[PDB]
Design a protein around this ligand. Structure first.
Ligand code: ADP
Ligand code: ADP
Ligand code: ADP
Ligand code: BEF
Ligand code: BEF
Ligand code: BEF
Ligand code: MG
Ligand code: MG
Ligand code: ZN
Ligand code: ZN
Ligand code: ZN
Ligand code: ZN
Lengths: 343, 337, 123, 366, 373, 366
DNA sequence: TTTTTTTATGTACTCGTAGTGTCTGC
């Protein structure tokens, strides 16, 4: 199994088509781009007839197997496409994929599109049977730090000049939404075909259609970026995510921070992080937070968190969205008034 | 498993209650105010055995008629039970509605009908309201049985339409004798368990049978460690569990006994653990002890009442607020009118 | 517009109605495409049914006094009226305002129509 | 079989004629005047606390509306329609257990059939019981029908909690507030029915039942049936006293005098003794509330005291002679809050202990 | 009058002319001017509290737009269309109880038949009552029809809480908010109705009915019907006061005056008198709280008393001239706490009495003296 | 119907050329450059705020794509199909209200109509309005059609809520997001139509209409039509101000403005106006608490103001800058206590007024 | 580099299945 990124696919595709291609990632844009490149190269190499299927307990599997085992009157080369569910390949789906690999043939090219593969998913034997001769493509969304480099690289690929300001604006407005980022890049390239993009040109045709996760909010709170935390919170509210998800995601980390701040009086943070399986980036963020947070701030944060939880669960109130800004402004560097933490 | 474990203290009441049904003048709705695990379920089961029996005698079921056999097997077309669904501690309105709609048709075996709700305190407002009218004017030969921790906790409308029977707990000496017969342990711990169970022998016996006694010992040790130092956060390790309200109640009883010892009350709920209560009494002032007790009981009530609440956050915040109260110069809460 | 009239037998009308019903009756793309287009010309009757890509037209001979007009009447309702009449009874049809009147032996119906100007036709 | 299951008093003694109704004179007068004068409405909403008689009043109104004698203020009770509606087989009267048929599908299905004619009676009466349990969609489905129903249909809503109804529903109905029955009315009704059924009783027991029923005839009747079952066919004072929960001893006054003196030792000893006697804690707290109320009342105005019980009121005069009014007021407030939060306690005894410890903490030194 | 079977006060006196509406002037003028100028929008939403005239105004607009004569703001009472719409079952108006047609499967059927020409009249008036009850798919179906409807279709949308509508629906149509009626307008309408029905009435009873109506005329008129029932067909101060379950101030003013003067004996005597009358004890506390709140009103601004309390106005002002605002704060808070604690008192009379005792004992100017030491 | 004035301004003033759409340059220029330079996508998905021009711009795209004078941004409007698209119906422009045709049984027929060659124009144009309400199976069918679109068809989907669409549909559509129109653009447009409709107007009335438009030009046009109605064919400042005051719903923010300003008469007048509208009082207190919390968050950091409160951004910013935090905390405490005590009040109106009076007593004016 | 959500009841909506009315060349 050759594991690759969408940057390196072209050369591999020029090396020669592989029996199976597994497009796996959480990013729609990179998955679609890799799929388009694979299909274009296959069409160049004779693969003319394309078939698409969706994996589902409602999938007519017999039709898929017959198509994989039936020759066509025209364009004998065939491409099979599958769309993995959000849960990935289930055990029954794993057996179905094993049977499909058993019927894999030279004249048939197989493409798989779906979310990331969890360890158990590739543990299943069909994955290894494919990996004996296949290529896997990890289309994972670049993190916050890696976004400007990718945006600049794509801009240079698309033959348009981007400065630091426009790149920063695009990164701030389209994070986790690379599809909309490429839509905006096309929009700006077509709006002004001069190829030079600066702050005044890009500040017009860019909206804040970002896509975030609760982990982004928690990491923003940990790093102390109050403005970024508020941006993530507002974006998540506009998206419609359940506030209880945010409450739990913050609660786990906040309880860990409280315990580690309590324990820091006897043991340095280096051993404390290793005690409870804290990862390296998480180790750095947590160390920064524990150094920039006292006991009183953590206690007030927990008090506000439990007040918000009580408001949400027993009163069924709609003030949790506004109250979460209280935590956002309390954790970073700013103590809040007593009445807004208890009452 | 657990079944109709008849208890001696139900004997004077059961013989009475069946009499109210022997003359045929009994109320269709009998709400039993009995402490949990004290024996309300067994009494209701025996009463239903008498009621559904086609050929009964005296104060017990024949055990020979087909109704008795079907009742023993656990299946009967005229014996409906209303219990919380597996994994959920509530009684939905859908089950009550289905039962009420089934009551329209006649009894299959030609006898009477029994609808027994396991715990009326777990009724959802919609379910209790759907049961209101069915309770009021049931069809011919229909019998309702309800059990509750507290009758006043029920809906003010449902409880009105029901004859209320109170099962008096046995005197403390009789209960301690019964549990000494059942369990071979010290008298001090047994009396402490009986007082913890509000005098209900069944709840204390269940506490001893389960791992709750080990948990109480661990919590007492944690309190012993934490009282002089104020390291109340460690109590979380002993407090966070699926039975957190019981342990919060144990802590509340310990604070009760500390306040009593400061006031010098002759008898205490925690007689088996004098060292911990003495340490709590001397180390903590009564003014802050009252605030800690009130906050602990408030957290217990919040944890019990609102379903889906997170035990971790509530218990952690309670411990942190207690630690904050321990520090001098901090305002204390006052009960609200 | 107005003054259009039919006088047709059920036997000479039922079968062309079945032929022109086709796919009509279901929810259409446009509200008009549920109505058969009724036309009179040179003493013959034209039934038209359209699906934005189909057009089935049935011609019926007329030997009765009439008038060369046009209208659009709901397919299901008109077919049910023409089917429920007694066997051999003659249907007399006219128009007034936006109401198309159907008459048989001691029987009268009024149906809501649409102007022929809005009916789509294949170019 | 004349419905043997009716042996329960709450099912047998519901009134069948306007004259049989006890209390509720204002709503009865309004209904009688409306029926006699012809000022008939199409949406009556009888709202009040539980066990007051709004369902029975609504059924009597339906009987009066659908009687073959005419639109009479006093139903005959013997006509074919009256007998049928007593049997419950009357088609023209529809009783909706809205706490069970709360879905909107059933409400819409019912409202689509309002246009049809009644089978036998003049009016197609709709007895919607426990209206507040309907879904919001079910409420909003009723607006057009309640505004302008046909002349042959009438809605008789009956809720125990009018404030949960949408204002658009309260706006279309004649609201009849069923006043809670007084102690005297309950006592007289209980005496009348018990003497009708030839049941041994004592006037003091009836007074206790009326006072402890909390202004409801159904509660008093259920307590009477409980007393009958407990006392073997007689409503004896001792049995009902041990059942409802009474304080014949002066332990309440001793508890008050120990607490107001900040004597925690005596307070806890008295609590232990009372628990050893199986005291009912809520009745105990009620007695302390009454004692403190009388103490404050005599503190304001001399005499006008618990002259009923001279023995304790002498010591009460001493207490009113010593204790400042503010301490009495705060003690009463704390006892009341403890009674309020008594259900929200792991044990009733523990709740009373909480209340008394809070009372002690106000003046622990003095 | 005729009063054929007394077909309910609410239904009988529904407005039939644009001059008969009790004074929603801000919408009446707009509709009359739009009808006169020919600016007939194809969609507008009536909103406002209960029983104000939204449905009645919608019927009036359908009257004006369906009249045989030219489109006028003064529909005729002889017109065949006007008579039919008054009696209902009109050909053009389509009474659509949206609460009974929430499902989109019915809104789609409505939309399928929108293009058919009306049988009579000019505008096929779609009157949708309780619009906020429609399901989301129903609203989205209504969207494009409301944006570009047929030239002979007008939409008559009415609801109680317009905020529940999707915002684009609010955008596609005009908005008319019908303000709740003032007390004087309600009283004048009640006087008109009772005079036309020839029923004896008194000014105080009608003022009380208007006050208890809370700004909604349908409540006022149902309450007037219930008061007529309570009396022997006659509206009087005693009958309405008994029916509403309240006291006509005064008594409560004496209560609050004895409260502020620390005259506990008078407080107890007035409580005994109220018990003799047998009024609701919670009503006593509610009325005392209301009078204290009105005295606070007067304390803030002199022009805080309406004509309704004029009967005691000269008295009430004097209360605001002597009680410092902090004392009225303490009084109001104590009475509110007493009302909070009343349901848990040993007896309702006991709770009210203890509340009065606490109010007078905590009086700063005249506190209850400590007994001996 | 009668007389030309019946034409609704939301319908008659429908833009017909790209020079008529206003405030959407970032989409108009992109469409023009794409049409002129030959760059084209399989489908174009429009999105943004209500009443901004998504459907109008989609119709303009349909006009431009299907003019026989070449695929161009600016259609002539003289030839047959340009007029047929606007006046009457054009055969090759398929307009589908997806809200009316959510079920897959209609989208299946629609995609069975894509394999047929266009009649008049070169490009078969599909305009699907409110595409966010199609069913999931209909979305699957639409995705299947979009996977391999024939060269003679180009889709146009217009919607208000883009978040509901499948990500696989967004991936193949070049979404154009239209920003809410600025106040100045709305005012200039309203002045343009009013001057070209022979309707008198006054600049302050136009500014009020633009501010009340909330950014949607359709709202501005509807309020303009109502303002003309409220009066005699004249947009007077007094009539417009009265109409907006009648329709205004920001009682809470103006009320907290007056409360912090310590203007008791203004607070009472605002409470009167809120009572006239039947505003829920508990909801009013909840909104006021939310506003106070938000302004405190603004005081802590200016980033607390998101795009959700752009309408009232300036007022809240200025009331944050001018007011010390201590007054904010005291007012929040007073309002929270008042909301706690609101249910146990003689009525909600007097309870909320009493809470406001309590708040006004802190730091009053001379 | 793997990590996070409360319930109880009700109200629509859209789709396959499933069972049945009815009726047309079979
Ligand atoms: N006004 C009354 N007159 C006579 N009996 C009454 C009255 N009110 C209640 N009751 C008694 O209470 C029982 C239940 O009355 P019910 O009318 O159901 O009260 P509710 O209003 O709470 O439904 C009746 O069976 C009757 O015995
Ligand atoms: N403005 C008004 N003028 C005259 N009568 C009114 C008015 N508002 C309400 N009413 C009375 O209320 C009855 C019903 O009013 P309605 O318009 O249905 O209120 P709603 O807005 O709640 O539907 C009418 O028949 C009429 O008697
Ligand atoms: N940008 C704009 N320029 C001109 N008129 C507009 C604009 N946006 C909205 N309108 C007006 O609103 C009416 C409806 O516009 P429409 O584009 O259908 O809004 P929507 O985005 O909600 O579908 C149009 O007829 C036009 O009068
Ligand atoms: F208990 Be009743 F129906 F209000
Ligand atoms: F009662 Be109305 F139509 F709101
Ligand atoms: F108002 Be748009 F067409 F969504
Ligand atoms: Mg009832
Ligand atoms: Mg209406
Ligand atoms: Zn048996
Ligand atoms: Zn009769
Ligand atoms: Zn007319
Ligand atoms: Zn052209």
């Amino acid at each position: 199994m050759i594991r690759l990124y969408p940057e390196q696919l072209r050369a591999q595709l020029n090396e020669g088509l592989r029996a199976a291609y597994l497009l796996l990632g959480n990013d729609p844009l990179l998955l679609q781009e890799s799929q388009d490149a694979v299909r274009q190269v296959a069409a160049a190499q004779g693969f003319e007839e394309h078939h698409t299927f969706s994996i589902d307990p409602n999938t007519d599997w017999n039709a898929i197997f017959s198509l994989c085992q039936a020759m066509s009157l025209f364009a004998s080369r065939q491409t099979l496409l599958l769309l993995l569910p959000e849960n990935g390949p289930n055990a029954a789906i794993n057996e179905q994929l094993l049977t499909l690999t058993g019927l894999l043939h030279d004249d048939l090219l197989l493409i798989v599109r779906g979310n990331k593969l969890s360890k158990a998913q590739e543990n299943a034997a069909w994955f290894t049977a494919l990996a004996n001769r296949s290529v896997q493509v990890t289309c994972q969304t670049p993190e916050q730090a890696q976004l400007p480099r990718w945006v600049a690289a794509r801009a240079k690929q698309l033959n348009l000049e981007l400065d630091d300001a426009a790149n920063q604006v695009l990164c701030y407005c389209y994070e986790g939404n690379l599809l909309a980022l490429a839509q905006a890049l096309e929009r700006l390239s077509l709006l002004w075909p001069d190829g030079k993009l600066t702050l005044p040109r890009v500040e017009q045709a860019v909206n804040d259609a970002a896509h975030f996760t609760p982990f982004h909010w928690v990491d923003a709170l940990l790093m102390g970026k109050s403005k970024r935390a508020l941006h993530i919170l507002q974006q998540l509210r506009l998206e419609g995510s359940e506030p209880v998800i945010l409450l739990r995601t913050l609660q786990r980390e906040l309880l860990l921070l409280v315990n580690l701040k309590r324990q820091s009086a006897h043991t340095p943070l280096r051993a404390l992080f290793d005690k409870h399986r804290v990862w390296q980036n998480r180790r750095g963020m947590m160390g920064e937070a524990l150094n920039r947070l006292s006991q009183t701030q953590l206690r007030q944060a927990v008090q506000l968190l439990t007040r918000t939880e009580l408001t949400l669960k027993q009163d069924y109130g709609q003030s949790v969205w506004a109250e979460l800004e209280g935590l956002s402004l309390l954790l970073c560097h700013k103590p809040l008034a007593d009445v807004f933490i208890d009452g | 498993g657990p079944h109709m474990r008849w208890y001696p203290w139900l004997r004077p009441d059961f013989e009475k209650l069946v009499a109210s049904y022997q003359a045929g003048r009994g109320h269709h709705a009998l709400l039993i105010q009995a402490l949990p695990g004290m024996g309300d379920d067994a009494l209701i089961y025996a009463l239903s055995r008498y009621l559904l029996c086609q050929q009964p005698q005296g104060h017990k079921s024949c055990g020979h008629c087909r109704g008795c056999q079907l009742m023993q097997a656990g299946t009967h077309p005229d014996y409906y039970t209303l219990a919380p669904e597996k994994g959920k501690n509530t009684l939905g309105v859908d089950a009550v509605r289905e039962v009420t709609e089934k009551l329209n048709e006649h009894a299959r075996l030609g006898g009477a009908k029994v609808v027994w709700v396991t715990d009326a305190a777990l009724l959802t407002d919609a379910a209790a309201n759907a049961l209101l009218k069915t309770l009021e004017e049931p069809p011919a030969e229909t019998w309702f049985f309800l059990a509750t921790r507290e009758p006043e906790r029920l809906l003010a409308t449902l409880r009105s339409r029901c004859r209320l029977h109170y099962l008096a707990p046995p005197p403390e000496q009789y209960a301690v004798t019964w549990l000494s017969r059942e369990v071979t342990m010290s008298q001090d711990a047994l009396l402490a368990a009986l007082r913890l169970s509000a005098g209900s022998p069944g709840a204390a016996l269940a506490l001893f049978q389960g791992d709750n006694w080990q948990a109480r010992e661990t919590l007492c040790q944690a309190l012993a460690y934490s009282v002089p130092s104020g390291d109340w956060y460690s109590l979380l390790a002993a407090l966070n569990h699926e039975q957190a309200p019981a342990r919060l109640h144990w802590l509340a009883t310990l604070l009760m006994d500390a306040l009593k010892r400061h006031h010098g009350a002759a008898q205490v709920t925690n007689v088996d653990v004098p060292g911990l209560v003495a340490e709590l009494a001397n180390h903590l002032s009564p003014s802050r002890l009252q605030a800690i007790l009130g906050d602990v009981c408030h957290i217990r009530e919040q944890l019990m009442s609102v379903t889906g609440i997170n035990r971790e956050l509530l218990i952690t915040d309670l411990l942190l607020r207690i630690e904050h109260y321990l520090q001098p110069g901090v305002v204390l809460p006052v009960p609200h009118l | 517009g107005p003054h259009m009239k039919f006088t047709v037998e059920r036997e000479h009308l039922l079968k062309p109605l079945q032929q022109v019903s086709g796919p009509l009756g279901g929810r259409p793309t446009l509200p008009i495409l549920g109505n058969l287009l009724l036309q009179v010309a040179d003493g013959t009757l034209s039934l038209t049914g359209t699906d934005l890509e189909m057009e089935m037209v049935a011609r019926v001979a007329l030997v009765q006094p009439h008038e060369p007009g046009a209208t659009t009447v709901p397919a299901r309702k008109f077919f049910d009226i023409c089917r429920g009449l007694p066997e051999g009874a003659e249907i007399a049809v006219q128009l007034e305002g936006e109401r198309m009147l159907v008459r048989s032996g001691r029987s009268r119906f009024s149906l809501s129509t649409l102007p022929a100007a809005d009916f789509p036709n294949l170019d | 079989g004349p419905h043997m299951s009716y042996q329960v008093l709450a099912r047998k003694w519901r009134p069948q004629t306007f004259a049989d109704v006890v209390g509720q004179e204002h709503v009865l007068t309004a209904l009688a005047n409306g029926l006699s004068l012809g000022r008939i409405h199409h949406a009556y909403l009888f709202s009040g606390t539980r066990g007051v008689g709004k369902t029975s009043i609504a059924r009597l109104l339906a009987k009066g509306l659908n009687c073959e004698t005419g639109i009479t203020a006093t139903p005959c009770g013997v006509c074919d329609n009256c007998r049928e509606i007593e049997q419950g087989r009357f088609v023209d009267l529809i009783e909706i257990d809205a706490a069970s048929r709360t879905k909107v599908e059933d409400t819409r299905d019912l409202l689509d059939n309002v246009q049809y004619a009644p089978a036998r009676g003049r009016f197609k009466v709709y007895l919607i019981d426990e209206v507040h349990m309907l879904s919001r969609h079910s409420f909003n489905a009723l607006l057009k029908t309640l505004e302008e129903p046909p002349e042959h249909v009438k809605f008789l809503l009956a809720t125990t909690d009018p404030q949960k109804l949408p204002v658009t529903i309260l706006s279309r109905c004649l609201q009849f507030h069923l006043k809670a029955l007084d102690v005297e009315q309950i006592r007289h009704q209980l005496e009348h029915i018990l003497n009708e059924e030839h049941i041994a009783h004592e006037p003091r027991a009836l007074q206790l039942l009326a006072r402890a029923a909390e202004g409801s005839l159904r509660d008093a009747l259920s307590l009477t049936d409980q007393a009958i079952a407990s006392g073997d066919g007689q409503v004896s004072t001792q049995a009902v006293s041990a059942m409802l929960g009474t304080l014949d001893d002066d332990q309440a006054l001793s508890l008050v005098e120990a607490m107001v003196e900040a004597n925690g030792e005596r307070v806890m000893a008295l609590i232990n003794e009372a628990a050893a006697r199986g005291i009912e804690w809520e009745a105990l707290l009620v007695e302390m509330l009454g004692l403190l109320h009388r103490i404050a009342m005599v503190q304001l105005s001399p005499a006008a005291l618990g002259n009923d019980m001279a023995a304790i009121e002498l010591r009460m005069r001493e207490l009113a002679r010593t204790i400042p009014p503010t301490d009495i007021q705060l003690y009463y407030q704390t006892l009341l809050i403890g009674r309020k939060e008594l259900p929200y306690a792991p044990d009733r005894r523990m709740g009373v202990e909480m209340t008394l410890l809070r009372a002690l903490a106000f003046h622990p030194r003095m």
